[PDB]
């Protein structure tokens, strides 16, 4: 529902179909105040990632310069299962 | 310039489609009949003709009640309605009963033949009949064509007879005109060989076109459950255009 920045933006709560419009855009403004791409994600407070949470996550990467102005870490044992199903782990720095 | 290219490709396939349907008609009628060919023609006269008897007799009455009610409202201002029995039986015999009874035959018994021969093509009954050796044009198609050329001129007469009797009901018995001047106005102005025979020859040319189209569309389908239903609207449209098209050509010759 909410996400903070600090130094590493962490996504917390649940992302499902009636909180995904402000949560996508609250993180979108974060990217443009942060240059030289250290914005690596440590998403771990997610509990019910259900492929829409992947959909807002790739859309943050779409704006980022080049095509990898970030990195993802500490996946909640289930979001990465979604990633191999869409064959996306040649495209996300999951390590 | 693709839309012009698609439009020119549309009417070239529709021209070629006429040439296949012309060669299909010369194979049916230029053949002496196979043994057993009259037993199927009597049965196919039941499906095409007798089932169409209810719609034509009822709808023929409803036009007669309209022609008697509209012809009285116009002929009462000029005060000459001894010509009411003439203009009712002259509108039907030469003009409406050849035309309207072909617009209801194209719907009820015209499109039903295209579903009947069409569903035999998707369910492979036509292809199975040929491997036995039986030719499906002579077996299936040809008793349906000859039951269409016969059953429509027998139906425009029942349309015209019920339309005049219905027009006699609202003219004489409800609006109150003279009964004797109704009938005696007919025999003066309505000849037989110029009006009743020319209303029958007009329906034989109409019965050929509403049946040769409605048979060819159900024989040259594309075998698909939604390709059949697209060829049942192709045969109501094309019949109603050739009825009204050959109307003006036959009217200009007969009454010009």
């Amino acid at each position: 529902v909410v996400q903070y920045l600090n130094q590493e933006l962490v996504v917390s709560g649940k992302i499902d179909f009636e909180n995904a419009e402000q949560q996508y855009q609250a993180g979108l403004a974060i990217i443009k105040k942060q240059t030289s791409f250290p914005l690596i994600v440590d998403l771990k407070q997610l509990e019910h990632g259900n492929t829409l949470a992947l959909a807002v996550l790739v859309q943050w990467l779409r704006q980022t310069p080049q095509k990898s102005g970030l990195h993802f870490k500490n996946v909640p044992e289930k979001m990465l299962k979604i990633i191999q199903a869409c064959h996306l782990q040649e495209d996300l720095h999951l390590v | 310039m693709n839309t012009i290219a698609w439009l020119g490709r549309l009417v070239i396939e529709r021209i070629r489609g006429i040439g296949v349907a012309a060669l299909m008609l010369l194979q049916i009628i230029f053949s002496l009949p196979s043994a057993g060919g009259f037993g199927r023609f009597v049965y196919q006269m039941h499906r095409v003709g007798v089932m169409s008897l209810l719609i034509i007799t009822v709808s023929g009455l409803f036009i007669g009640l309209v022609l008697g009610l509209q012809g009285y409202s116009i002929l009462v201002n000029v005060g000459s309605e001894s010509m009411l029995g003439t203009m009712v039986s002259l509108t039907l015999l030469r003009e409406l009963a050849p035309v309207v009874a072909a617009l209801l035959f194209a719907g009820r018994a015209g499109s039903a033949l295209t579903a009947e021969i069409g569903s035999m093509k998707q369910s492979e009954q036509l292809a199975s009949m040929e491997m036995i050796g039986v030719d499906p044009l002579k077996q299936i198609v040809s008793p349906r064509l000859w039951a269409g050329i016969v059953s429509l001129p027998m139906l425009t007469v029942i349309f015209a007879a019920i339309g005049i009797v219905g027009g006699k009901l609202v003219g004489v018995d409800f609006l109150g005109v003279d009964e004797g001047s109704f009938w005696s106005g007919m025999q003066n102005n309505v000849q037989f060989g110029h009006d009743v025979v020319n209303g029958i020859i007009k329906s034989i040319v109409f019965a050929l076109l509403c049946t040769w189209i409605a048979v060819f569309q159900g024989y040259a389908c594309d075998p698909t459950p939604e390709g059949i239903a697209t060829a049942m609207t192709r045969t109501v449209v094309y019949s109603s255009l050739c009825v009204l098209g050959f109307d003006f050509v036959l009217t200009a010759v007969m009454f010009g």
Partner: protein, 263 residues
């Protein structure tokens, strides 16, 4: 494991005809449950009674306490967001494109912008394996790609109940081989709960974990596919093997022969 759908003693009559006189089913969570039987019985009407489109007459459909028919119009519209359905022929909407087919359950339920819907369709059509086709109509689509699009439409909300209805009925062994992996893969990565209605004994014994066999209105046998063949009732034993001995017969009439005179 807990049950998700508990069917408890219903009856459905389409006009002096008995379908499912008395029958009780259990759909355990996360577990592939197959329903087999002879053709003509109400197999694909059972999926419509589970899904809540046709109405029962003497029973209830239990979705975690709640009856289906007792739901309001704003809960039944919410409960149908937790269900998918892949039909017999891949019932696509032919008057609209592939991208409009997959986005149809998203736009009917949820209110999102176009830059998130067009990403979610590009993730659903990727997980099936049809990412490059997002603009063409569902004609010029091959028969092997027709059912795969309709799988992406039924899965486009992440439900917990997706009911396949004969997913391989007269298909090539290649296209049967692709679809039998996507039923295994997409279930296991999304925590689904599948229902396969089919009559194909080789795969259905080797893809299911609990098999119901309904024959004329009741259960002929149930259980894991070990004990289904070990507790073989005389109708199930003929069904799974295709034998010529049992309660369903070969001959039409047993009137000797010379007792008919062909006149």
């Amino acid at each position: 494991t807990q049950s998700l759908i508990e069917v408890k003693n219903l009856s459905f009559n389409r006009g002096e005809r008995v379908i499912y006189d008395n029958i009780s089913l259990n759909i355990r969570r996360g577990q592939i449950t197959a329903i087999m039987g002879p053709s003509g019985t109400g197999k694909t009407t059972l999926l419509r009674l589970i899904g809540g489109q046709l109405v029962p007459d003497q029973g209830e459909v239990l979705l975690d306490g709640k009856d289906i028919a007792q739901m309001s119009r704003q809960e039944l519209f919410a409960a149908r967001a937790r269900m998918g359905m892949l039909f017999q022929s891949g019932a696509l909407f032919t008057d609209m494109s592939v991208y409009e087919n997959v986005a149809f359950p998203i736009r009917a339920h949820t209110k999102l912008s176009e830059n998130l819907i067009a990403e979610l369709v590009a993730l659903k059509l990727e997980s099936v394996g049809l990412r490059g086709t997002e603009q063409l109509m569902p004609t010029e689509l091959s028969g092997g790609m027709n059912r795969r699009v309709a799988l992406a439409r039924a899965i486009a909300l992440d439900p917990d109940l997706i009911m396949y209805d004969e997913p391989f009925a007269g298909q090539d062994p290649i296209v049967k081989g692709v679809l039998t992996r996507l039923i295994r893969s997409l279930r296991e990565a999304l925590d689904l709960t599948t229902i396969i209605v089919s009559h194909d004994v080789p795969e259905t014994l080797s893809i299911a974990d609990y098999i119901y066999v309904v024959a004329e209105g009741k259960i002929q046998g149930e259980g894991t596919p070990e004990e289904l063949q070990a507790y073989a009732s005389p109708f199930v034993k003929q069904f799974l093997t295709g034998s010529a001995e049992g309660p369903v017969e070969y001959q039409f009439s047993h009137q000797a022969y010379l007792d008919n005179e062909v006149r």
